Amino acid sequence: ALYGTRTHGLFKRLGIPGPTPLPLLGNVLSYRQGLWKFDTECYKKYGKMWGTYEGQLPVLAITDPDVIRTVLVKECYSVFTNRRSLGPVGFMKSAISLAEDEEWKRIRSLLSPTFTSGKLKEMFPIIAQYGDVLVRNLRREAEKGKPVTLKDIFGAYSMDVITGTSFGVNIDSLNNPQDPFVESTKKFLKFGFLDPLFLSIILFPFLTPVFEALNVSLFPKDTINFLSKSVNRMKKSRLNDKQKHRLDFLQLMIDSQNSLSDLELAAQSIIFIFAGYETTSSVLSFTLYELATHPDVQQKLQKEIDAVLPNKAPPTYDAVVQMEYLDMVVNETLRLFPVAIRLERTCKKDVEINGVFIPKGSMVVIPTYALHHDPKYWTEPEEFRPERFSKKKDSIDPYIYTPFGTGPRNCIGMRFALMNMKLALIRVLQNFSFKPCKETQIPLKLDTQGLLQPEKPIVLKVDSR
Ligand code: HEM
Ligand SMILES: CC[C@]1(C)C[C@@H](OC(=O)CSc2n[nH]c(N)n2)[C@]2(C)[C@H](C)CC[C@]3(CCC(=O)[C@H]32)[C@@H](C)[C@@H]1O
Ligand SMILES: CC[C@]1(C)C[C@@H](OC(=O)CSc2n[nH]c(N)n2)[C@]2(C)[C@H](C)CC[C@]3(CCC(=O)[C@H]32)[C@@H](C)[C@@H]1O
């Protein structure tokens, strides 16, 4: 009867193991140690499948590849079409990721042409120009002999490529410390699942219509207002530029208007900036950390770069995407550090998952981090071994290794993100070597809040070649 406990007997009734939930809270306060940690410990303790509660919301975690393939691929359109229902977001409900069902299919179908093979190849010289700025700014920090905080300069690179390619504007995050775009992303859900507003929605989902009527949002009003005005400024500039320009992300949405509302257009732009910034920055920083602590891998990778691009030859799109050892290094980094930590799907109706009848509205979790570190699938899972992804080896199971997800709801900017990071890695490894200093944290400790990120900022010594 009590509102805090109505569903907390479900998994016990179904014979599904899991940690005993607390009234009102469920198991959500166990997230405070980091979702990567909670999922791993539930996996090791309960096995192939376990259940938890976010407030009263039942959460079923699955690790079997075939069950994962059923949820993410086979029954996506019919059952598992959307992820969680976030809460009060305002107009950001129309963002491609947060849109649901047929509205999501339409928006994704409209935006997907942004990342065709031709469009990725077309925008590659824009990314290469920022790569030149990256090497030069990095040499400036290197030649003082002092260690380099990677997220400063690679965050600026990550924000520059997503801004220059999508909106056709060079905001020059790399050369303008105090970048309003970078700082606007910082306020969003700092405390993660310990965020008071987000936690109140988890405990009391019926508060969402109340907060929507009050224009309260999980997104910071300041961030939303700055990015919307920025998008609208670049938009008006594009309509007045009596000159040539790419058919880019911004133009694609402008074309949809002249035949997508002003708010919907802002929502897509805001999501692309959020999804593209911290992800690309973190993975680049994780990769260089692993290369600095594995100098044999760093040397071998530099040898492939010099063989394919002799005499510091500028990379081409084809060169970037076809360097085998570079691909394995990036894949192995994403195995160790899948920054989204897990995949989530909502049951839009009752469904039987692996002989288990799960009610409508429940959440299914694919614990990407736990599966990436599972010794059942990877020998010595904590070790950084790019040779795991050798083309000569057996094919990697696409439902165990899910750093970008799988199925119709997977990462739409996967190839774009892989091109950005590989371009940056080639250019800096053509010019520099990376090694740890006294200020480097070895081994790397993970934060407990939000995205998979280091507890302390990664700092490395950078020497010229
Ligand atoms: C290394 C960098 C990146 C990682 C690890 C990453 C990871 C992910 C993951 C795990 C998902 C969820 C897929 C699923 O639920 O099955 C996702 C979705 C998404 N990503 Fe990425 N991503 C990255 C870069 C980017 C970039 C650069 C963009 C923008 C250009 C982007 C835009 C999106 C969008 C829009 C979605 C939602 C797709 C949808 O719901 O239809 N991501 N990403
Ligand atoms: C803001 C975009 C959303 C809502 C959160 C994302 O996360 C971010 O984009 C960065 S979170 C952040 N950046 N800065 C601060 N302070 N927090 C996640 C977690 C991920 C990294 C990229 C993909 C996806 C979908 C599935 C996910 O796993 C999320 C997007 C598309 C989401 O729709
Ligand atoms: C799926 C990723 C996780 C597990 C949930 C996220 O939530 C999403 O990413 C929602 S994306 C979506 N919801 N509905 C649809 N259609 N797409 C949260 C809540 C957030 C928005 C983005 C950051 C973070 C960490 C701290 C949080 O607070 C969560 C990620 C990194 C989590 O690891």
Numbering used by the authors: 23 to 281, 290 to 495
Paper quotes:
Cytochrome P450 3A4 and 3A5 catalyze the metabolic clearance of a large portion of therapeutic drugs. Azamulin is used as a selective inhibitor for 3A4 and 3A5 to define their roles in metabolism of new chemical entities during drug development. In contrast to 3A4, 3A5 exhibits homotropic cooperativity for the sequential binding of two azamulin molecules at concentrations used for inhibition. Azamulin is a relatively selective P450 3A inhibitor that is used for reaction phenotyping.
The 2.46 Å X-ray crystal structure of 3A5 complexed with azamulin in the C2221 space group revealed the presence of two molecules azamulin bound in each of the four chains of the asymmetric unit. The distal azamulin molecule is stacked against the proximal azamulin in an antiparallel orientation. This orientation places the second macrocycle in the upper portion of the cavity with the amino triazole group positioned between Arg-106 and Ser-119 at the base of the helix BC loop. The amino triazole groups for the proximal azamulin extend out of the active-site cavity under the connecter between the F and F′ helices and reside between helix I and the C-terminal loop in an open channel that is designated the S-channel. The macrocycle of the proximal azamulin is positioned close to the heme surface with C9 centered 4.2 Å from the center of the heme iron. The hydroxyl of the proximal azamulin donates an H-bond to Ser-119, and the amino nitrogen donates H-bonds to the carbonyls of Phe-210 and Thr-207. The hydroxyl group of the distal azamulin donates an H-bond to the carbonyl of Ala-370. Arg-105 donates an H-bond to N30 of the triazole of the distal azamulin, and N28 of the triazole donates an H-bond to the carbonyl of Arg-106. As a result, the buried hydrophobic surface area for the 3A5 ternary complex is more than twice that of 3A4 binary complex with a significant contribution from stacking interactions of the proximal and distal azamulin molecules in 3A5, which likely contribute to the positive cooperativity. Comparison to the 3A5 apo structure indicates that the distal azamulin in 3A5 ternary complex causes a significant induced fit that excludes water from the hydrophobic surfaces of binding cavity and the distal azamulin, which is augmented by the stacking interaction with the proximal azamulin.
